[PDB]
């Protein structure tokens, strides 16, 4: 009877936190975490956890207002301090450095994250840790600090490694991996290779992060110049399930890229602004890769001259020839092309490669 009573009370709570999430009332489930805290007391610290965990993510899934949302965390994390309940305070701690992340509150993120990895490096079961060091290796990209977030991610990895993760955790780390490679500009070759093990490790697990690795390998290929082998990534039996918009972008700009065409690529820009633009990765290559087709429009424009007029190069580019001078110049001086320019009577001479 009192073994039982109690679980239906488990239960009880999660379920009126999960009407209030529905009907969103945010500020009754701030009143029922404070309320349920007497509760507590009659169940395990394991148990206790489990149920004040599980709450707080119901509050922090509901737009209640970012500020409302820090405040109800560092609520809880002073709540389990005041109360010594070490493994969950921490636990809570990693929850509020997510928060400060996805909120862009990436100082913060640093400042606790530093705190709470002193702690973190003092014990067993590092599984935590490694959660911790790849919220590092993400807020110190975002930042901007490459060194530091490769740093850190290499730490992660290197605690992953005594450890069997699950298959969700592995799956960031070969994204994160794959983020970081392709970052730079520098390692597309490679970066693929962790977006190929991350879409292979979270396929039928996450498949929203499925199709994100997936996305990403696309990236890559198109990167590399490699745009011919997208179709048969995208045609073999595993990822034909994955059609959606994103990939209708990809396989929209891989196809500009084959054509050699910016008209293309700027369509392509801009009727899939949401699916291209507005992710932070892609978005984060969308400057260099802009240039490679305007370069590879440019050879495809130029390749039947020995020799032509920039105002014929640039009618057919639709670019103002002021601008479209200045552009084959820099690929003559930088190597990127075997020709000469008349400045004078504007033309473009072409040598045999
Ligand atoms: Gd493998
Ligand atoms: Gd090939
Ligand atoms: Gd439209
Ligand atoms: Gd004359």
Known sequence: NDEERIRIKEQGILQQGELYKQEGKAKELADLIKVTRPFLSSISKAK?????????????????????????????????????????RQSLEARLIALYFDTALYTEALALGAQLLRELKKLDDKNLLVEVQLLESKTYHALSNLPKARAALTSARTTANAIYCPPKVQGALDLQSGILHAADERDFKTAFSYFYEAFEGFDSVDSVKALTSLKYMLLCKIMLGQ???????????????????????????????????????????????????????????????????????????????????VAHVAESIQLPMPQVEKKLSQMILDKKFSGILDQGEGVLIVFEE
């Open 48 to 88: 206790a956890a489990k149920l004040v965990r599980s709450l707080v993510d119901m509050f922090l899934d509901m737009d209640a207002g970012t500020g409302i949302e820090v405040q109800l965390c560092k609520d809880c994390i002073e709540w389990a301090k005041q109360e010594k309940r070490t493994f969950l």
């Open 227 to 309: 745009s011919d082998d997208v179709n048969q990534l995208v045609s073999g039996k595993l990822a034909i399930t994955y059609s959606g918009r994103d990939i209708d972008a990809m396989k929209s700009v891989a196809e500009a890229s084959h054509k050699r065409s910016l008209a293309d690529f700027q369509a392509a820009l801009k009727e899939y602004k949401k699916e291209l633009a507005e992710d932070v990765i892609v978005q984060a290559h969308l400057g260099t890769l802009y240039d490679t087709m305007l370069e590879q429009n440019l050879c495809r424009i130029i390749e039947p001259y020995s020799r032509v007029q």
